[PDB]
Paper text:
A short fragment of SLX4 consisting of residues 1014–1028 (SLX41014–1028) was sufficient for binding with TRF2TRFH with a KD of 750 nM, whereas binding enthalpy between SLX41014–1028 and TRF1TRFH was not measurable by ITC, indicating that SLX41014–1028 binding is specific for TRF2. SLX4TBM contains a modified sequence HxLxP that highly resembles the TRF2TRFH binding motif of Apollo (ApolloTBM), suggesting that SLX4TBM might bind to TRF2TRFH in the same fashion as ApolloTBM. We solved the crystal structure of the TRF2TRFH-SLX4TBM complex at 2.05 Å resolution. The structure exhibits a 2:2 stoichiometry between TRF2TRFH and SLX4TBM. Each SLX4TBM peptide adopts an extended conformation with a short one-turn helix at the N terminus and fits into the narrow groove formed by TRF2TRFH. Except for the very N terminus, SLX4TBM and ApolloTBM are identical in overall conformation. Two key hydrophobic residues in SLX4TBM, L1022, and P1024 bind to TRF2TRFH in the same fashion as do their counterparts in ApolloTBM. The imidazole ring of SLX4 H1020 occupies the same position as the side chain of Apollo Y504 in the ApolloTBM-TRF2TRFH complex. ITC data showed that alanine substitutions of these residues either completely abolished (SLX4 L1022A and TRF2 F120A) or substantially impaired (SLX4 H1020A and P1024A) the SLX4-TRF2 interaction.
Shelterin consists of several proteins including duplex telomeric DNA-binding proteins TRF1 and TRF2 that anchor shelterin along the telomere repeats. The telomere restriction fragment homology (TRFH) domains of TRF1 and TRF2 directly recognize specific but distinct motifs on their interacting proteins. Here, we report the crystal structure of the TRF2-binding motif of SLX4 (SLX4TBM) in complex with the TRFH domain of TRF2 (TRF2TRFH) and map the interactions of SLX4 with endonucleases SLX1, XPF, and MUS81.
Author numbering:
A (entry chain B): 45 to 183, 186 to 244
B (entry chain D), D (entry chain C): 497 to 509
C (entry chain A): 46 to 123, 125 to 182, 186 to 244
The structure:
């Protein structure tokens, strides 16, 4: 019941979380992935996990899924039948719960992820997947888009403005801004100590 | 039950 | 050391310390987990020099020893059993810690003996033979006992029966730790302060 | 050339 290794592990987790966000923000996704992998390895160790660690990890989960979102070959679900962005949708719901966010606050960002999930499948000519995603998650306000995407899928029209104008870079950076807006902007202890040490 | 490395899994399988 | 490097170094050394501590208490499960964290760290800037290299050689040796009973796993690009890889790492430890042949010979002997015996216990007689040939005027009685054990497929021999992998791996740890500074890592010092 | 994660590889391949 003791914080000793847990205390250091928390410091380490929060340090790499900070560095992962920093990397993602500078569009250094290679660095992000490397840091992600360190954090994955830490998860087996005692962290004294509570709601704040849980919150950090959900955000990290969502970003990791978004960073792999263009890679349809990979999966985060044991039911390895979900595209990365579909898993991202799932994590966003957990983020809504653990950050206690209103529907109004999350709706806009959920729409982006859903839009991206469908478009990425379309760009990869995975029309049946896009169709399933569109059905499952977009089945009132974004009617024009849902209908555009439905026609794009039916007609296999990758040439469409909706598809051609889509920027995954713009999308993922928008998601980071959203996710970061619900986090504390505190400098991690290890970084503070390193600055002191030089 | 499965621990944090599974329930809060960061990297793909 | 630059900013991220400074932290990565503290992190690496903290887990190194914890890994040694886990190994020392026969908590090999904890050791493997910490090993995996340190492996993940290796892609990050560490400002690697000779003392980081030293720490990692020791960690490399222990990791191969901890997996030593598992002949199914491999540490080299192609064919080597874990303990054969441990032998290789030991030569690098000798170089990077600048050790005498005298100081490392007895420990090299232990690893060599263990490498052959583990193969024999798994009835991997051809592997044992190759390792015995490759790696073994002092260990005359032993390598002749091992040569005869392999030739006769004699699992019942006292040399085989009295072998203790726990005893072996703990002797290897004591040897490796004896060339390390036993300083408390910064992050642990900081944690004790905080708590 | 391959970096530290390869040359000082800790985990089995």
């Amino acid at each position: 019941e003791a914080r000793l290794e847990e205390a250091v592990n928390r410091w380490v987790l929060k340090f790499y979380f900070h560095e992962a966000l920093r990397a993602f923000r500078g569009s250094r996704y290679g660095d992000f992935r490397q840091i992600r992998d360190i954090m994955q390895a830490l998860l087996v160790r005692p962290l004294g996990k509570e709601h704040t660690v849980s919150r950090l990890l959900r955000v990290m989960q969502c970003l990791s899924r978004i960073e792999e979102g263009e890679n349809l070959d990979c999966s985060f679900d044991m039911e390895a039948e979900l595209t990365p962005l579909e898993s991202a949708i799932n994590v966003l719901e957990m983020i809504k719960t653990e950050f206690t966010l209103t529907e109004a606050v999350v709706e806009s960002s959920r729409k982006l992820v859903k839009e991206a999930a469908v478009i990425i499948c379309i760009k990869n000519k995975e029309f049946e997947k896009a169709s399933k995603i569109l059905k499952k998650h977009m089945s009132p306000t974004t009617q024009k888009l849902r209908n555009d995407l439905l026609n794009i899928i039916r007609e296999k029209n990758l040439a469409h403005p909706v598809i051609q104008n889509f920027s995954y870079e713009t999308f993922q950076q928008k998601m980071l801004r959203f996710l970061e807006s619900h986090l504390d902007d505190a400098e991690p202890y290890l970084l503070t100590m390193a600055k002191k040490a030089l | 039950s499965r621990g944090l490395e599974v329930s809060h899994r960061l990297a793909p399988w």
